[PDB]
Amino acid sequence: IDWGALEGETREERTFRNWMNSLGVNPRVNHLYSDLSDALVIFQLYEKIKVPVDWNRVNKPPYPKLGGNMKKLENCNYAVELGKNQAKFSLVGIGGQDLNEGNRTLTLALIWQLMRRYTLNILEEIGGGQKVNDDIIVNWVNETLREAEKSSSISSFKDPKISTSLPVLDLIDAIQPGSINYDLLKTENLNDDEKLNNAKYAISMARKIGARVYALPEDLVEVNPKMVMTVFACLMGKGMK
């Protein structure tokens, strides 16, 4: 869990690699554009968004020097075919070259759509149907926090209470017992570091229960609607009913 800026990266890049690392990925990603060239990671990702993979066609890791690039390109081409045809992505100007060559744009151009598809599959999974929206989720989170008598309601996903992440920890304690230390529950959480402490804490412990949180402390301490909604969504997640 070595969080930190790499050797000239970007704020989106860290979100995407943390999405990957939080998602149970077998080889630890140091950084994207050198680890995804063989595409095996993306083959692991398709299955997680419920998209089949023909592992017979998937070349195993290129061990030969001689095979090398060609096997990687077969893999990358099949990955792009999965993107376009079955799973219905838009990859107009993309082929296996751009993945194997580590083009900084088009790699991500696949990744963010994969991320959205996983999020959307989730959003279907919470409410049996098609989609959900802030109405139902804010209703139920406020019901839950009402039951535990702990703390205040979510009036919006722009609520500054989440800058401290104390609603989040109140909530993690609301669904499940006091399997959690409260000495870090510290009001007047005004030092940025302390908000970050509570935030790293909340993320780690939502993952501990099994809630599939991929967030950053920088995304709760600074309130960000889509992202914070996603945190609460994946907390709907593991256990509702």
Partner: peptide, 12 residues
């Protein structure tokens, strides 16, 4: 010849 050997092993 090594290129040929690489070739014939591929799937395509």
């Amino acid at each position: 010849w090594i290129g040929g050997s690489i070739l014939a092993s591929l799937s395509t």
